[PDB]
Amino acid sequence: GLEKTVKEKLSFEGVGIHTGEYSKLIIHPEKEGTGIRFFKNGVYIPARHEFVVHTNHSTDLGFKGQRIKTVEHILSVLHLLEITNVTIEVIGNEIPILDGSGWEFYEAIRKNILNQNREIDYFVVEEPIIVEDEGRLIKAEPSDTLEVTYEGEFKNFLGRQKFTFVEGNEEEIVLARTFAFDWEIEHIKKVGLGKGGSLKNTLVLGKDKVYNPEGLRYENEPVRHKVFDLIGDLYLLGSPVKGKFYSFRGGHSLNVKLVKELAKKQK
Numbered sequence: 001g002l003e004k005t006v007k008e009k010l011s012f013e014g015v016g017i018h019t020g021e022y023s024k025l026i027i028h029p030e031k032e033g034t035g036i037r038f039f040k041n042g043v044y045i046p047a048r049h050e051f052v053v054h055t056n057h058s059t060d061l062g063f064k065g066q067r068i069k070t071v072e073h074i075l076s077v078l079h080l081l082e083i084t085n086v087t088i089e090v091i092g093n094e095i096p097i098l099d100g101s102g103w104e105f106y107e108a109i110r111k112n113i114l115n116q117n118r119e120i121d122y123f124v125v126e127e128p129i130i131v132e133d134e135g136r137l138i139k140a141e142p143s144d145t146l147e148v149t150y151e152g153e154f155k156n157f158l159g160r161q162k163f164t165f166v167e168g169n170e171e172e173i174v175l176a177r178t179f180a181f182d183w184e185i186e187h188i189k190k191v192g193l194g195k196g197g198s199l200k201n202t203l204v205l206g207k208d209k210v211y212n213p214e215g216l217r218y219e220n221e222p223v224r225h226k227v228f229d230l231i232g233d234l235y236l237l238g239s240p241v242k243g244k245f246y247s248f249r250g251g252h253s254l255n256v257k258l259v260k261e262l263a264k265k266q267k
């Protein structure tokens with residue numbers, strides 16, 4: 001497809017799920033060859049794996065003392081829409097979580113796409129690779145289309161679930177929300193995270209219970225969300241990606257490990 005930017009500046013704002021602080025974003029159009037980058041306090045932070053500074057419970061980027069938490073959801077939306085040139089100006093320390101999904105970003109950006117003059121140079125996975133960490137595994141292999149499967153093995157009523165995204169089915173993952181298990185919330189708070197988390201932006205589950213009165217958006221909403229997170233982390237390769245991926249229990253740390261291995265291989 002063609003390289004794309006946005007037709008005009010787009011703004012979003014709200015609390016961040018980890019910092020609990022209110023932040024604002026301004027998405028700026030950019031010319032061909034710019035890539036996706038964040039901008040904070042005069043510093044440009046490219047949306048690339050070299051700038052990752054944290055991967056426990058979110059993917060965070062930094063450069064020159066400026067950090068931005070929780071980039072995975074906005075990057076996943078930009079990857080799905082194949083927006084390739086944009087500056088995401090952040091006034092604050094984290095991307096707003098909004099309702100926990102990519103919906104508000106997706107609906108706004110999709111109506112404001114500007115096609116540009118050259119075609120995208122995709123990051124094309126050249127050969128099969130497997131990355132692993134303590135029972136968690138991610139495999140990547142060649143494909144002319146982006147295809148991403150996530151399989152979960154939950155320690156509650158959900159049990160085993162799998163979901164596969166293929167191109168054309170973007171609408172099936174952009175409404176799936178971030179989620180948390182009630183038994184894990186104390187740890188998240190104790191490590192200085194989850195300060196903005198609530199039932200308004202997170203699907204919270206117990207061993208048997210669903211805390212959210214509105215329930216699940218889909219019976220497999222958590223694995224749809226994990227596919228969505230992986231698509232955001234894959235955009236840290238620095239170009240939209242063509243490959244077939246399978247993640248068994250992967251999280252941001254393993255997703256970033258895969259990206260760094262693929263980037264090294266194809267240097």
Ligand SMILES: O=C(NO)C1(CSc2ccc(Oc3ccc(Cl)cc3)cc2)CCOCC1
Nearest residue numbers: 057072178179180188194197198199202229
């Ligand atoms: O979506 C994600 N990454 O993008 C995950 C974020 S984990 C995460 C867990 C809990 C939090 O705080 C909360 C504190 C209290 C409440 Cl009531 C609600 C939430 C905040 C964050 C989930 C999928 O696995 C990868 C990590």
Ligand SMILES: [Cl-]
Nearest residue numbers: 056057188191
């Ligand atoms: Cl941690």
Ligand SMILES: [Cl-]
Nearest residue numbers: 056057251252
């Ligand atoms: Cl994680």
Ligand SMILES: [Zn+2]
Nearest residue numbers: 056057187191
């Ligand atoms: Zn932790």
Ligand SMILES: [Zn+2]
Nearest residue numbers: 072178225229
């Ligand atoms: Zn997420």
